[PDB]
DNA sequence: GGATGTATATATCTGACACGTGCCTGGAGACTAGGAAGTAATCCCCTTGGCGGTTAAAACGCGGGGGACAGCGCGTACGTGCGTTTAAGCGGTTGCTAGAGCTGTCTACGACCAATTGAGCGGCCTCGGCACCGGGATTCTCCAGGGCGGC
């Protein structure tokens, strides 16, 4: 009961590299990275909601936080990823 | 004798004080639930002062040469100044649209709560692969017999 991100990072690793392992320190670094990106995007979306006098955080605020924080092709590819995930989640 | 410098008085300009009003946001009073303080138990990590042994890192000394720094020359590129151009800055036209603010209505979306159950965490059993032990096949070193030579 430690509430980590290790199993999902492991499944993503088996998606991109099915025959590659990962050490415990590298897994801790990946968990810290996911937590850092989560709190950056959530803080930017919270600030965006407060700037526009909105009481809710929607996918638009998350999208704007992604386009604000992520640079270059990372931003547009993450927008395409999140957009098609939201489209798949809505239709079904 | 005429006009100029200077002092006191009066009207006007301007920042500041108080009065008035709305309104809406903070304060007063009451109630309630849960966040956090406190308590006890268990277990593992950290503290302080020691010992022993390995060993690789740290320290010290010394020679030498590479590099930092100073000086000098030179030539070029930037500062300085002036005359000319040009465009910024201001004021102005003329319509339309974007956007803030306010009011109003409504609806879909998210909070909330109860029941459920299935994905996450731990252990247990098994397989894939690596490794330990016993047995069979192949090649290397050696001891002895036969033949020849000498007195």
From Swiss-Prot:
Transmembrane parts of this sequence: none
Gene Ontology molecular-function annotations: DNA binding; protein heterodimerization activity; structural constituent of chromatin
PTM note: Monoubiquitination of Lys-88 by BRE1 gives a specific tag for epigenetic transcriptional activation and is also prerequisite for histone H3 'Lys-4' and 'Lys-79' methylation. GlcNAcylation at Ser-80 promotes monoubiquitination of Lys-88. It fluctuates in response to extracellular glucose, and associates with transcribed genes.
Cross-link (Glycyl lysine isopeptide (Lys-Gly) (interchain with G-Cter in ubiquitin)): 88
GO cellular component term of the entry, any: nucleosome
Glycosylation sites (chain numbering): 80
Cell compartments where the protein resides: Nucleus; Chromosome
First-listed, main subcellular location of the protein, grouped into a coarse class: nucleus
Keywords of this entry: Acetylation, Chromosome, DNA-binding, Glycoprotein, Isopeptide bond, Nucleosome core, Nucleus, Phosphoprotein, Ubl conjugation
Record text on subunit structure and interactions: The nucleosome is a histone octamer containing two molecules each of H2A, H2B, H3 and H4 assembled in one H3-H4 heterotetramer and two H2A-H2B heterodimers. The octamer wraps approximately 147 bp of DNA.
Known function: Core component of nucleosome. Nucleosomes wrap and compact DNA into chromatin, limiting DNA accessibility to the cellular machineries which require DNA as a template. Histones thereby play a central role in transcription regulation, DNA repair, DNA replication and chromosomal stability. DNA accessibility is regulated via a complex set of post-translational modifications of histones, also called histone code, and nucleosome remodeling.
Family: Belongs to the histone H2B family.
UniProt protein name: Histone H2B 1.1
Species whose genome carries this gene: Xenopus laevis (African clawed frog)
